[PDB]
Amino acid sequence: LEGIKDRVLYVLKLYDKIDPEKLSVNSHFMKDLGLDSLDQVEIIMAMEDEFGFEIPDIDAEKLMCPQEIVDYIAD
Amino acid sequence: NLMLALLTNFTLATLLVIIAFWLPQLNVYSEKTSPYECGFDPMGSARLPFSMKFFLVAITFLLFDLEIALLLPLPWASQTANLNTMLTMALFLIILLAVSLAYEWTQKGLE
Amino acid sequence: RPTVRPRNDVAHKQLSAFGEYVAEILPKYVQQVQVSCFNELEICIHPDGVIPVLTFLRDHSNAQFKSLADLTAVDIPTRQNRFEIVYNLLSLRFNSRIRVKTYTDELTPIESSVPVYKAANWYEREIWDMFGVFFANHPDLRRILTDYGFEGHPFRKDFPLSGYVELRYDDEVKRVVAEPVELAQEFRKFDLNSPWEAFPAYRQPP
Amino acid sequence: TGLVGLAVCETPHERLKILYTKILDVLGHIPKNAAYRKYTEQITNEKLSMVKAEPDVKKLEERLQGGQIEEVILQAENELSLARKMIQWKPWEPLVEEPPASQWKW
Amino acid sequence: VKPIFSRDMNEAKRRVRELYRAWYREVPNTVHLFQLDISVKQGRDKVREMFKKNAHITDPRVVDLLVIKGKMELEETIKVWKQRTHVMRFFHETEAPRPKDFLSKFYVGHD
Amino acid sequence: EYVVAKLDDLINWARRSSLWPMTFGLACCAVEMMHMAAPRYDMDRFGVVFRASPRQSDVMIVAGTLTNKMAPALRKVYDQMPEPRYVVSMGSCANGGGYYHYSYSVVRGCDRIVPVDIYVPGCPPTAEALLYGILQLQKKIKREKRL
Amino acid sequence: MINILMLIIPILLAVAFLTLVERKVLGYMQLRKGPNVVGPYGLLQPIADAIKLFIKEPLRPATSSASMFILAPIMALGLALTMWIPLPMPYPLINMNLGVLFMLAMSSLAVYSILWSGWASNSKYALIGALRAVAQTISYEVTLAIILLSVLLMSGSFTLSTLITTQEQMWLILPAWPLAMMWFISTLAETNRAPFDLTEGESELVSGFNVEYAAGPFALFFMAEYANIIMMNIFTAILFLGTSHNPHMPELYTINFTIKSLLLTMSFLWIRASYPRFRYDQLMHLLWKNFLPLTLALCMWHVSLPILTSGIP
Amino acid sequence: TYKYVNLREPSMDMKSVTDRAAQTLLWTELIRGLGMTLSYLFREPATINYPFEKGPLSPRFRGEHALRRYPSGEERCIACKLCEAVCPAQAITIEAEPRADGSRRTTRYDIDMTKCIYCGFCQEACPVDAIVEGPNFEFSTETHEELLYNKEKLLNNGDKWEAEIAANIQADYLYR
Ligand SMILES: NC(=O)c1ccc[n+]([C@@H]2O[C@H](COP(=O)([O-])OP(=O)(O)OC[C@H]3O[C@@H](n4cnc5c(N)ncnc54)[C@H](OP(=O)(O)O)[C@@H]3O)[C@@H](O)[C@H]2O)c1
Ligand code: SF4
Ligand code: SF4
Ligand code: SF4
């Protein structure tokens, strides 16, 4: 989708306890970036407010990378 | 003078407020609260519609008050005009007001 | 006996028939142990099904209790299973009192009495507050006899009488009332226990 | 005439006889060997014979109720609900559940 | 299968997450509607440290019991109840002792 | 010099004349607090007029047991009072728990929440002894503002 | 002008000395001793409250409103004390071109004191006592004008000076027998110390126009609310009482007029102690549903009477 | 027994309907209710003003605690820890050491008024009748420290009430 990767990366970089340049595109938030069990999916919850669509609890477990999150965001 | 009579009462009333406003002063802490009366923190912050319940009975007053104002000629008008011609017309306004209240009996409202 | 005995047993034989009547149904799902002493009846119930027992005693033609007025719970750490929910029941047409008990540890959820009784839900809130026993399929489990920001359960025998957080100073903060202060005045722990058993027959073999 | 409870005492005879005849058929579906069927039947059969014998007198209401027919009808109205619930949840017929830990003495 | 509690071992992990989402959205709402108190940024860090102390995960019975308890102490502002700025404040403000040193605690004389 | 010293006593005479209590329905002490309105032992327009509302009253009488659920509630009521305010903690619960004291919920002595000027020790606070709680209050008001 | 200043300062004292009667007569009604300690019979206590509530008591509301709120006790006194001016008395202060029209208009304008006190606190707790005060007054303004019209058509015009001269032999209580009974209820339209009353007293709900106000504004409200009770008592003693006129001797009128009013002054405090509150819904059912068809039937009756037998001013 | 609150309609025909309608049309019964408090105004009030007049009491009454002594000196309290155990509030504290030589009577004796529900238990439990409850009312302090009683001393200063206690205990022995 056009104009989806640019919007999601801007919101994730602004959030606290995250690297500004080290982790970007196709990198795991829990495995590569370094986040806690509750802190990893917490960034995905904040990203839902910026896009304007509610995310279910079942689909949230599968998402970890911004490249994977961009595909799930499109409906 | 009516103007001098009304203003002297009004100026004396507002002056008594100033006496109670400036004399008692020592400390004003963050102590005063929004709801008071019973205590605790206000669950209903600022303002919320509430409304209803008396919406029909209040509206009817605005409609009835105009008729009572139109009944005010009765003691002041019946002095020069003919009484027999007035009798049919003076009662007429009072009769129809009872008819409107008779329609108010068939389901008055939530009140 | 003139002042020695309180009352003579005469209805005890008729009350013993109740202890047989429910036992004649004979469920391992319900019955277990039936105890009857001092003009009263006590039944303890298996945790798996409590709601079917509560539908019984209510409505029934021979025993029409219906009113399940009082609802208590026991705090005891002697057994392997800790808490014990005790129902106190009363009949208005039959004029008799019967008791319903549970035996499980009930740190794990137990069946609720809200579909059977309408006032039992308020008593169910008392148990969850004081002890920490959750009721399954309960509508609105609100706190009554506990503070709004209270940790643990205020009645348990495992923790002290004075409590962890109890003392509330106003101190240096302008409006916020303090909580973390824990020191209180000394409650004298009476270590009194009289030698020799007062009563025969109550003594158990080791 | 007015009843004590909120439920108004409606002038209806044989109405009590319908509900008691209904519950007898419900009991004879699943439990037969169980005591729940055998013990409830003898109370109902004794009660139904009293209704047939007495011709609309207050003495029929005085037989194990003594609060008019309306109060006795409420016990019959909820009788069908408890009988259906007893058939739905298996407890009367089956007895195989586990027992608690050996401790009772306080 | 006794006792159920609410969910299985793996399903219990996502029940806490569902509770976390509802409470994460309430920290901006507990400032404007209630009181100024501290901060939005510092308030969110106070939430994270509460779950880290409770983090063990060994039995489904323990985890599910924390959810129901969490659906009362954190539900105190969901349907909006009075706390009066004395409740809900979990962290100590007037309590300043944090000594963990054999050298530090022994100088103050304790235990 | 002499007019200034007597004017301060004239302002203090108004508090010596009349003080409006608060109807704190907190425990059993509140029932004997209702006995102050009862004719046999009266302060009704002797120096006490019941009206409630914390904004209008001058004296608040804490009538019984206070808990941790009540500690934030009573505190701001005292703050809702006008600045010349007096607190009379009446009863053993108001002085540090009747029994309680070593209990989990009860706050000890009211002084932990709100400062108290006049103490009444009586559990069932006898109306005879309660009358001091208002009469000694008026006697304690002696001098205000020197400069 | 000296007469206006000689009708505020002694009148504020009458509202001050009311506080005695508010717990002396009400006290003996409840079998309890009222004012006793402060003065010889507690006579120094009413003047002590003026030293108590104004000089030392300081409160201003929290969240508040802007200019309004403190505007309301100015509206309380400055519209209820002005009501003393159109009063006929032995001799009136500036005799109106039409008397009772100014009495009815300023009384409805005096209701605004409890109305603006709703927006005194922005919080919703105070305005419930205000919304209740709307309906407990709005309905009773209908009959208050109608029952007046039946009396006014019977005797003279709107001018209050003619109402004294019309009662030379007998009172107006006897011809207007059911209408006089109505003016023990319809007078309690304004928030007054009564059993019927309005949302002002505590009992069940929080105190209206008192929970938002301090002491100083709240003290100023009582000096206006209890002032209206005397005002209605005098107004009933003009419309229904009279006894004698006598323009030559004002001394014989002034004593006789006060006794008639004072008997009515006790009667409202007699009502206050005796009976419970009528409820918000059911006070709207006393009038409108039940009393409004009765008053209009008597209004119909009082239209025919001057035509049946000559009765025109 | 059944008393029945329901009247089952007092009105029937002509005479019984019109009088029940007359009270609802005007007032009558409300004027009858008005006259009920009229007679109540006429009768004298049963009121007692405190600074001069005093209220009725009993020979056995409990107020502020005071400990008694023998007619020829000596402390009547023997130090048991008895009254300590009976005390539901645990307001009374007692620690004992031998008094010089021979007699062994008290060292610490504090009765906290922060607690104490006033039972008369300690008055009844005492075998030597040390704590005898007097008809006290006047107690008002600035601080908690002034309120709670110290090691006897203030409790020993119950001599100003012991003259009444001796008269009250004459009604106590061979009870009432
Ligand atoms: N502006 C600041 O915040 C600031 C900045 C820098 C440093 N400081 C320092 O911090 C301190 C702040 O204290 P503060 O100004 O908050 O105290 P304060 O409000 O002036 O209170 C002092 C109290 O002591 C009494 N008092 C003082 N001198 C007295 C005298 N000669 N005779 C009788 N009574 C007397 C007063 O009682 P009465 O009212 O009954 O007379 C008053 O209640 C100052 O001493 C200052 O050196 C303050
Ligand atoms: S001090 Fe006594 S009377 Fe007062 S509230 Fe406590 S227990 Fe009740
Ligand atoms: S007061 Fe009496 S019971 Fe208590 S220690 Fe003294 S002698 Fe013993
Ligand atoms: S009266 Fe009761 S509470 Fe008071 S000291 Fe004696 S035993 Fe203790």
Side-chain angles (χ1 to χ4, degrees), chain F residues 37-61:
Chain F
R40 187 169 275 270
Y41 309 99
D42 247 0
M43 274 303 287
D44 181 66
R45 208 58 92 113
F46 290 89
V48 150
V49 173
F50 292 91
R51 201 74 83 106
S53 75
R55 211 141 273 187
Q56 293 186 311
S57 59
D58 292 57
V59 171
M60 54 170 279
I61 303 157

Short mmCIF file of all heavy atoms in Angstrom, two decimals, chain F residues 37-61:
data_model
loop_
_atom_site.label_atom_id
_atom_site.label_comp_id
_atom_site.label_asym_id
_atom_site.label_seq_id
_atom_site.Cartn_x
_atom_site.Cartn_y
_atom_site.Cartn_z
N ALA F 37 -30.11 18.27 70.61
CA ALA F 37 -31.34 18.86 70.08
C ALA F 37 -32.57 18.47 70.91
O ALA F 37 -33.58 19.17 70.88
CB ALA F 37 -31.53 18.47 68.62
N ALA F 38 -32.46 17.36 71.64
CA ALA F 38 -33.52 16.88 72.54
C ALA F 38 -33.69 17.81 73.75
O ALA F 38 -32.70 18.14 74.42
CB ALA F 38 -33.24 15.45 72.99
N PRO F 39 -34.94 18.24 74.03
CA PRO F 39 -35.30 19.28 75.01
C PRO F 39 -34.69 19.18 76.42
O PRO F 39 -34.32 20.21 76.99
CB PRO F 39 -36.83 19.21 75.09
CG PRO F 39 -37.23 18.01 74.30
CD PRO F 39 -36.14 17.78 73.31
N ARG F 40 -34.60 17.96 76.97
CA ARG F 40 -34.13 17.75 78.35
C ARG F 40 -32.72 18.30 78.60
O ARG F 40 -32.47 18.93 79.62
CB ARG F 40 -34.23 16.27 78.75
CG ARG F 40 -33.91 15.99 80.22
CD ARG F 40 -34.26 14.57 80.64
NE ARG F 40 -35.67 14.44 81.04
CZ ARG F 40 -36.13 14.61 82.28
NH1 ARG F 40 -35.31 14.92 83.27
NH2 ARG F 40 -37.42 14.47 82.52
N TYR F 41 -31.81 18.05 77.65
CA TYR F 41 -30.49 18.66 77.66
C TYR F 41 -30.28 19.41 76.35
O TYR F 41 -29.89 18.82 75.33
CB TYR F 41 -29.40 17.61 77.89
CG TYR F 41 -29.62 16.70 79.08
CD1 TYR F 41 -30.17 15.42 78.91
CD2 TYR F 41 -29.29 17.11 80.37
CE1 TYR F 41 -30.38 14.58 80.00
CE2 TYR F 41 -29.50 16.28 81.47
CZ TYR F 41 -30.05 15.01 81.27
OH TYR F 41 -30.26 14.18 82.35
N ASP F 42 -30.57 20.71 76.38
CA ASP F 42 -30.62 21.53 75.18
C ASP F 42 -29.54 22.58 75.06
O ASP F 42 -29.17 23.23 76.05
CB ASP F 42 -31.99 22.21 75.05
CG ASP F 42 -32.81 21.70 73.87
OD1 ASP F 42 -32.34 20.82 73.12
OD2 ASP F 42 -33.94 22.19 73.69
N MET F 43 -29.02 22.71 73.84
CA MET F 43 -28.23 23.87 73.43
C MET F 43 -28.91 24.60 72.27
O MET F 43 -28.33 25.51 71.67
CB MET F 43 -26.80 23.47 73.08
CG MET F 43 -25.84 23.42 74.27
SD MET F 43 -25.69 24.94 75.24
CE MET F 43 -24.74 25.99 74.15
N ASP F 44 -30.15 24.20 71.97
CA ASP F 44 -30.97 24.81 70.92
C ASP F 44 -31.25 26.28 71.21
O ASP F 44 -32.04 26.62 72.11
CB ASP F 44 -32.28 24.03 70.72
CG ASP F 44 -33.15 24.61 69.61
OD1 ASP F 44 -32.73 24.56 68.43
OD2 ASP F 44 -34.26 25.09 69.92
N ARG F 45 -30.58 27.14 70.44
CA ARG F 45 -30.56 28.60 70.61
C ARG F 45 -30.06 29.08 72.00
O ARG F 45 -30.27 30.23 72.40
CB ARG F 45 -31.90 29.25 70.17
CG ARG F 45 -31.80 30.69 69.67
CD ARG F 45 -30.86 30.85 68.49
NE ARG F 45 -31.54 30.74 67.19
CZ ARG F 45 -31.69 31.74 66.33
NH1 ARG F 45 -31.21 32.95 66.60
NH2 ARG F 45 -32.32 31.53 65.18
N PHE F 46 -29.40 28.17 72.72
CA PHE F 46 -28.57 28.52 73.88
C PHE F 46 -27.18 28.90 73.37
O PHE F 46 -26.46 29.67 74.01
CB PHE F 46 -28.46 27.34 74.85
CG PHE F 46 -29.74 27.03 75.59
CD1 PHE F 46 -30.67 26.13 75.06
CD2 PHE F 46 -30.00 27.61 76.83
CE1 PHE F 46 -31.84 25.84 75.75
CE2 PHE F 46 -31.17 27.31 77.53
CZ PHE F 46 -32.09 26.43 76.98
N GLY F 47 -26.83 28.34 72.21
CA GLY F 47 -25.57 28.61 71.52
C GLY F 47 -25.31 27.67 70.34
O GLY F 47 -24.24 27.72 69.73
N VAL F 48 -26.30 26.83 70.04
CA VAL F 48 -26.20 25.81 68.99
C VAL F 48 -27.48 25.77 68.15
O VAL F 48 -28.59 25.68 68.69
CB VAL F 48 -25.84 24.42 69.59
CG1 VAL F 48 -26.40 23.25 68.79
CG2 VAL F 48 -24.33 24.28 69.75
N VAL F 49 -27.32 25.88 66.82
CA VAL F 49 -28.42 25.75 65.86
C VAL F 49 -28.00 24.78 64.75
O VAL F 49 -27.05 25.04 64.01
CB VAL F 49 -28.86 27.11 65.27
CG1 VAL F 49 -29.89 26.93 64.15
CG2 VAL F 49 -29.44 28.03 66.34
N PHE F 50 -28.73 23.66 64.66
CA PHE F 50 -28.49 22.64 63.64
C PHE F 50 -29.02 23.10 62.28
O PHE F 50 -30.18 23.53 62.17
CB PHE F 50 -29.15 21.31 64.03
CG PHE F 50 -28.51 20.65 65.22
CD1 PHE F 50 -28.96 20.91 66.52
CD2 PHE F 50 -27.46 19.74 65.05
CE1 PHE F 50 -28.38 20.29 67.62
CE2 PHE F 50 -26.87 19.12 66.15
CZ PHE F 50 -27.33 19.40 67.43
N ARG F 51 -28.17 23.02 61.26
CA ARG F 51 -28.51 23.44 59.90
C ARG F 51 -27.78 22.64 58.82
O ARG F 51 -28.21 22.62 57.66
CB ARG F 51 -28.24 24.95 59.72
CG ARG F 51 -28.99 25.63 58.57
CD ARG F 51 -30.48 25.82 58.86
NE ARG F 51 -30.74 27.02 59.65
CZ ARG F 51 -31.28 28.14 59.17
NH1 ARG F 51 -31.62 28.24 57.90
NH2 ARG F 51 -31.47 29.17 59.98
N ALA F 52 -26.69 21.97 59.21
CA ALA F 52 -25.76 21.25 58.31
C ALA F 52 -25.11 22.18 57.26
O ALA F 52 -25.07 23.40 57.46
CB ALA F 52 -26.44 20.03 57.66
N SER F 53 -24.61 21.59 56.16
CA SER F 53 -23.80 22.26 55.12
C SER F 53 -22.49 22.85 55.66
O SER F 53 -22.51 23.84 56.40
CB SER F 53 -24.61 23.28 54.30
OG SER F 53 -24.86 24.47 55.03
N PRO F 54 -21.33 22.25 55.27
CA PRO F 54 -20.01 22.60 55.83
C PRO F 54 -19.56 24.03 55.53
O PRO F 54 -18.65 24.54 56.19
CB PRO F 54 -19.06 21.60 55.15
CG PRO F 54 -19.94 20.56 54.54
CD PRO F 54 -21.20 21.26 54.19
N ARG F 55 -20.20 24.66 54.55
CA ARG F 55 -19.86 26.00 54.10
C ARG F 55 -20.40 27.10 55.03
O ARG F 55 -19.79 28.17 55.13
CB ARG F 55 -20.38 26.19 52.68
CG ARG F 55 -19.54 27.14 51.84
CD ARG F 55 -19.42 26.62 50.41
NE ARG F 55 -18.28 25.71 50.27
CZ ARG F 55 -17.85 25.20 49.12
NH1 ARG F 55 -18.44 25.50 47.97
NH2 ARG F 55 -16.81 24.38 49.11
N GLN F 56 -21.52 26.82 55.69
CA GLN F 56 -22.20 27.79 56.56
C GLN F 56 -21.78 27.72 58.03
O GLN F 56 -21.73 28.75 58.71
CB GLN F 56 -23.72 27.63 56.46
CG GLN F 56 -24.32 27.99 55.11
CD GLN F 56 -25.84 27.96 55.10
OE1 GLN F 56 -26.46 26.99 55.55
NE2 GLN F 56 -26.44 29.01 54.57
N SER F 57 -21.48 26.51 58.49
CA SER F 57 -21.19 26.23 59.90
C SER F 57 -19.84 26.76 60.39
O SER F 57 -18.94 27.03 59.60
CB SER F 57 -21.28 24.72 60.16
OG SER F 57 -20.36 24.02 59.34
N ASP F 58 -19.72 26.89 61.72
CA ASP F 58 -18.50 27.37 62.37
C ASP F 58 -17.74 26.26 63.10
O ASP F 58 -16.51 26.27 63.14
CB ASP F 58 -18.82 28.51 63.34
CG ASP F 58 -19.28 29.78 62.63
OD1 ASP F 58 -20.27 29.72 61.87
OD2 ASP F 58 -18.65 30.83 62.85
N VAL F 59 -18.49 25.31 63.67
CA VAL F 59 -17.92 24.19 64.44
C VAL F 59 -18.37 22.86 63.83
O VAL F 59 -19.56 22.67 63.55
CB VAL F 59 -18.29 24.28 65.94
CG1 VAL F 59 -17.91 23.01 66.71
CG2 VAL F 59 -17.63 25.48 66.60
N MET F 60 -17.42 21.96 63.61
CA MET F 60 -17.73 20.58 63.20
C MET F 60 -17.43 19.58 64.31
O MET F 60 -16.32 19.57 64.86
CB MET F 60 -17.03 20.20 61.88
CG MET F 60 -15.52 20.40 61.82
SD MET F 60 -14.77 19.68 60.35
CE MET F 60 -14.64 17.95 60.82
N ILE F 61 -18.43 18.77 64.65
CA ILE F 61 -18.30 17.75 65.69
C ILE F 61 -18.18 16.37 65.05
O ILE F 61 -19.15 15.86 64.47
CB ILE F 61 -19.47 17.80 66.71
CG1 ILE F 61 -19.58 19.20 67.35
CG2 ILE F 61 -19.30 16.74 67.79
CD1 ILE F 61 -20.94 19.53 67.92
#
